[PDB]
Subunit: 503 residues, 4 copies
């Protein structure tokens, strides 16, 4: 039969991960440059490496040191396939060791001097014949392998960049995948395009074509069920499936009582009314509040909420007839992290999995949704935890507390959006603390906490630099408009040592 | 492809500064839209075939003699009409109502009847947090109308006649300050007016590529390439539509940022495979600017020499029928002479692939085509470049210093994530000196602003330690700089650029 | 030394929130002053023998009947009189003028005649940058008056009758918002009223030491010593005046900051050589507070136990005639509003006579006195500390476990504020213990500390402090990293109004 | 003859300076504790040390290392006088070296208290600990015999020591800095408990001492004082007025480089309010003429200093029979770290009166407060000798000074109004002779660009640009642009010291 044209993944880069926290950034930067990419652990089998058919290979950094026994090595086939190879920091060091060089034992900015312009450096520079890079100060290449030439250096790091342009092996002692390296994108672009010969077909407009066709091929005339939350990933999945298979899609939305003000109404408005998708709404507030009654331990709260949600979803799924497929919003980071019953549903339900985002990074999901016409407010919304307000009401969850928190959180959101600071944070939300303070008669009422952070990875996060007068306007509004709130505090704890959510 | 503009909304402009926001929010909801002045002829309104009409706000009063009125055909086509503030006031007056003469501010309106416009929407229960227009108010609603929302000060905050499908609000749903404003307008264009959702970046690309191939055929097109968002998206669209028929001319006027010319060539010629001719004209611009201190004279000189350099490059090409420009829909709305301002011997026909798009639609288009974030979300760069960021006489010595200090500024803003948290940022060279440790050297100024429209702007809320990091880097890495200052002047009464 | 109060200015209060600022500005200009309600009896005013009278502003309108007026004796003593806002309006009415009916704002007034009040003063040339009270204006100036300053919007901004020496301004010279306000009031008390400048810290010390020796003689005096500014300055003054006749009792109620008791003993007993009896009462207060969650009940318990501990210590002393207290002039001062409404609160067996060496002094004068006597900056500029101490900074039940944690976190906060220079850039700063927990990182599940810091001049309105971002981050990181039982730090971002400064 | 009673300086501490930038802070904390102190270089002669009669000696820190060649040593008599000695960092290290110990070659630390001597006493931050500002580097590897280690860290086993028989004390951290939480209390235990000193060095007693000393020096003779209105000359004026009354004459010179109405304000306070004889010399035209065409900042400073002395000398020559010139010299000016009177022409031969020359800056302020001088006078930021002459970049012109005076005044008004004046150590406007565009409604402005400068600092050796609130700075720039037609734009100096200076020229 006719099958989906997959031309836009023919050009591809393989990233072998040696342990660096930046390894996924390499893969993401290749995709931003218009080239398909996948990442695997360094000990990827030779069979899989050949079967992948890479146009080029990038060896990431890692927290290891080659001169220690049992240190990671690249598979030898990497240097024998006849395709270019780029080694980043440790990747450069293990490339040197395995090709006749030597590595001698030993993070910050450095200005490397361009001593030879190969095809990786090309015409690039910051200051003249220099590159402002993010350097890993540690191990260094003591002797470059046969056929290599030093292309860049610093006084303290004489081997900052090298290349054997006959075998097309390249290496840098700095990280081009991070923003701290000013020409990092441009360097990686030179590697995948000029050096590896890859085109630029991996773009949102082409990915939509590919994925709609692949979905049609997988699903055919069959029905697909989607758990719809209104988060970015499930929203784009719903839009993709609606475009692909139309009314063969059915969505189930569960209101667990732990959502923000009018969130359920908003999900129905956008997906059922605006977009014309079939959406079943399960209103389960009382069930969740009952399951949570008297539960103060946060881990127990998270367990209960996850369990009741699965039960409610399974109940709704059982009312449907002849649904072969369960769609989920799995993204490529989920799949990378797993290799480092379907849907977790009870066994009476037997779905096959549909995962249209499973090969996409988070920014690609957003670009896809924008291309499909999904509005800014939906695509750029901050993440919302699975347990919802269940982990933003400290200790016991009560309906009275959730209702107050919804009002206070909505004021916070309104002011962030009106002022333009919503998109200038990565996460923001109110927290209900079940303690009271005095305010002016003289009344005595709950203390609300505001949480807002700046981050790119959510692995480190700083409390947000919100303007003084914005914060003051928000706290004044919360206290003036909610009789049950005496006082507002702001979380001034960064990650680490604090977490982003309080529970 | 042309099916994607068949559903369409007409916005009649009564003078509000928010009128274009109405048209933009319709497009964001997935429906094509156009905006015209209120006095649109009945012939043109009928020809537009609107699925619905929105009457904007405005700074006029219905009771004043000669005040604007909607042409009565608006209420006779049998399509829904939404009046916003003045649009509702003139709607009431022209349908047998009364308006009582009377500031902007927030208001909590009470929902009293849930019609098709309000629907199920609310903020607090049965309320809406809105950006209210005080002053003139409807005192008697026309026959067939029902009050749908109110405030104590404003008993007629919203109304509808759902038989004739006439809707009205006394607040502004088109601004962010009305919490459910997007949703109210969505109910109007989709639920009330029956419009679908085909006006999306993926479909707009297909339509515009088709239209470009129809206009251009196999003929050649010339494009002035700057690197700004508009010219970048035009270049990508044209490259897709007509391939090798496109020729770009990029002019390095000596007033660009560090390595800017190399980066333009790297991206458009090398990465994207577009034919780009680079005119290196630094000496020409510096020679023309030498000894010229008046900023208006500098701007005139730079604009004149740019056109001359562009004309000289264009004359070298053979058989080019078309000149492409990055005109956007706000440019056409504002407009309502040789092509390109070029000499008479150059007679091009105009190609304008973005002329029906707003700024954010242009960016969504570029993103859909795979253009990188750094290109699409770049801050604007003025025509005269560094020529208006070097106070008084422009000398190569000053431009070279400024390029280094500006580059440090940009590096720190991008690295810290604050580049995208400002609307505009750049360094300025002041030809004055101060002492440092002994050093006597130039004083650099940093400019950064927050704004959504560039009409009013506040100086940016950059974190103290980021600014300290930037000034310390500049002073430590550039021997010729003694000190860094930060522009703490908002617009108005300061302009964004210094010259 | 009593000469230093012979020159004196009387301020009649018509209800303005700035009325006390007038009296304070007079004292800063070196002239003794007192403040009373507008309805001060004529016999009292004559007995006061003022060298000049200032009629303050007020929240009333002269056109509405039932509104306050000044006693005519004010305009009949032959001493200069200055009317501020409402004081100018009622002066105009009662002297043959008219006031028409008409909020606060800045204004540049034009000087049209340079009398003794305006003098050679100006901001921009022949102008004054002032803080105006709009609303009611003077339409007809009284006879004998010349208009001395004006605005387009307010043609009568300042007046004077230099033969009768009656002066009036439509703006408030007593507030910082008026750029030349100090200098105008200086021209009034010195040039116009002839007052000298003897009311200064060095002379006040000599007068007060002399008066204390006259009141106390060779008798014994007991002082409750808290470590706050007022009690510290009382202790220093009494030590100077009566030496070994002074006995201090300091009570550690278990609700003080880290090492606070040791610091009181170090400074007052060790350094200054004063007799200080230390009552270590932590267990007693914690036992009385255990299981008590209501904040009003906590305050009542703490106040009751403190008096009981103090009384038990007072009973151990032999033949003590006087109890000294840190009462200051704001505690006693007569307002237009305050007029509209056993010693030490001790048991009956304890009958002391009251000594109040600061009762005629404003807060800043108390600090200047302490500085003059050599008390260190850290003692004189300490933020206030509430009577109930940490009792109202631990939400709900007070436990030793919570107080110990709070002391550690508060001490870190104070260290960084004093180190960085921001302690003196706030009016009040402290940590609060919230008995709620949050997750941290192995996983931590521990208490959430709140930090409170405000900026204010009067404590009637206060904004949360503009602490630098990186300082707050340094404080929160230290607290979380150094106290195992704290997971997270929050910052109170609530201003007054509508929030209070203390949480309980 | 009866001479001034100097009992309040009998108790005294000698500080020997080995080169630390914090050495003066030691001397200042002793005075804050109520004890007179003086500081001299480490190589103070035995004769002078004995003549000083110290009740205690503190050996300061230093950048040197005991084992470098030519490294400083304390005069051995320091350990032979029978008075207590405290060594701070290098002072501890050289104390150990010279008493038989061994020395083996900046950040916070929590030192563990292991033995409570009379220096540590009952002090602690966290229980049995001290939060201190440590000097990582040279460590005492072997304490002299008779010493006990009193405090330690894991990385610095010898953080504090004492031999309480000889009363020698030592710390590896700096108690004189604000970074050491209990630093004041530690120094207080040393000067009071350990050295037995009282607390008579207080503002009220200093006033009595200095007034009597001034009367003894001056008698019935006349005194001339150059009066600028700065804090030091203001306190000198107030002290001399109290001491000698109408024997004092002041001369104030308006050099045309002062702030708005500054001359009027000097006359208003000293001549009118305080009743002091003040001669006013209005010399603006003279200074502007001398500065015409001068762009080099060092030439401007030289010209302004020279012309000021000439103007002052002319006023001084009009006075008959004046024996004394008073100056506002303070102890930092004199102090010993590791020419005609007043710099006047030779025809003027004054004897010097210097009532503040043994006082630190904070003590000068306390004296002024004691005398009743207003807060605004006592806590005023410093103002440079050359005035606005170094705040107008390049050539000084009357047009620029007049504009700058208006801009600076707006800045000061808002700082004082908001309470942020006292929350900075220095603040001023700068006139840059460059222009930029503004929008004034439908009209275009093209006018000068004003810079604002404000810093936070304690020592003026390092200074950070001030953390002024966003909305306050916006209020200031809006006011300046809206009230001064000749200003298009306001910028804020965001350069800290180092690598920038506080003043621009
Ligand atoms: Cl809800
Ligand atoms: Cl962010
Ligand atoms: Cl987290
Ligand atoms: Cl360049
Ligand atoms: Cl912005
Ligand atoms: Cl502008
Ligand atoms: Cl304690
Ligand atoms: Cl404050
Ligand atoms: Cl309060
Ligand atoms: Cl002046
Ligand atoms: Cl400061
Ligand atoms: Cl400096
Ligand atoms: Mg509900
Ligand atoms: Mg204890």
């Amino acid at each position: 039969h006719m099958t989906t044209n997959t031309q836009i993944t023919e050009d591809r880069i393989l990233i072998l991960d040696f342990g660096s926290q930046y390894s996924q950034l390499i893969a993401r930067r290749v995709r931003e440059a218009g080239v398909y990419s996948e990442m695997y652990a360094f000990d990827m089998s030779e069979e899989d490496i050949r079967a992948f058919k890479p146009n080029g290979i990038i060896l990431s950094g890692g927290p290891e040191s080659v001169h220690e026994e049992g240190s990671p090595r690249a598979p030898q086939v990497v240097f024998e396939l006849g395709v270019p190879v780029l080694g980043i920091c440790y990747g450069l060091q293990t490339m040197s060791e395995q090709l006749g060089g030597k590595v001698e034992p030993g993070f910050g900015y450095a200005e490397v001097d361009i001593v030879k312009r190969d095809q990786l450096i090309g015409n690039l520079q910051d200051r003249e014949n220099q590159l402002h890079v993010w350097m890993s100060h540690g191990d260094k290449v003591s002797q470059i392998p046969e056929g290599f030439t030093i292309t860049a250096s610093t006084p303290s790091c004489p081997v900052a960049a090298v290349s054997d342009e006959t075998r097309r092996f390249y290496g840098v002692q700095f990280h081009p995948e991070v923003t701290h390296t000013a020409k990092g994108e441009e360097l990686l672009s030179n590697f995948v395009h000029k050096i590896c010969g890859c085109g630029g077909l991996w773009t949102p407009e082409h990915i939509i074509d590919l994925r709609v066709e692949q979905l049609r091929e997988q699903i055919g005339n069959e029905k697909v069920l989607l758990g719809l939350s209104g988060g970015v990933d499930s929203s784009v999945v719903a839009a993709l499936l609606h475009k692909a298979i139309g009314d063969q899609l059915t969505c189930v939305f569960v209101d667990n009582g732990l959502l923000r003000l009018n969130e359920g109404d908003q999900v129905m408005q956008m997906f059922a009314e605006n977009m014309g998708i079939r959406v079943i709404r399960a209103d389960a507030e009382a069930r969740f509040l009952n399951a949570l009654a008297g539960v103060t331990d946060p881990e127990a709260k998270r367990k209960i909420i996850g369990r009741e949600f699965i039960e409610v979803f399974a109940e709704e799924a059982r009312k449907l007839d002849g649904v072969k497929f369960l769609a989920q919003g799995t993204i490529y980071p989920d799949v990378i992290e797993s290799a480092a019953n379907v849907g977790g549903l009870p066994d009476d339900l037997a779905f096959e999995l549909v995962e249209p985002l499973r090969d996409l990074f988070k920014d690609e999901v957003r670009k896809l949704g924008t291309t499909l016409g999904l509005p800014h407010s939906m695509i750029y919304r901050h993440p919302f935890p699975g347990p919802g307000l269940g982990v933003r009401i400290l200790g016991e969850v009560k309906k009275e507390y959730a209702d107050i928190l919804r009002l206070a959180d909505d004021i916070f959101m309104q002011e962030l959006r009106d002022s333009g600071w919503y998109d200038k944070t990565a996460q923001a939300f109110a927290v209900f603390q079940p303690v009271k303070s005095v305010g002016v008669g003289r009344r005595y009422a709950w203390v609300i906490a505001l949480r807002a952070v700046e981050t790119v990875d959510f692995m480190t996060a700083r409390f947000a630099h919100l303007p003084y007068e914005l914060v003051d306007k928000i706290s004044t509004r919360i206290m003036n408009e909610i009789k049950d709130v005496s006082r507002v505090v702001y979380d001034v704890s960064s990650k680490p040592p604090a977490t982003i959510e309080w529970e």
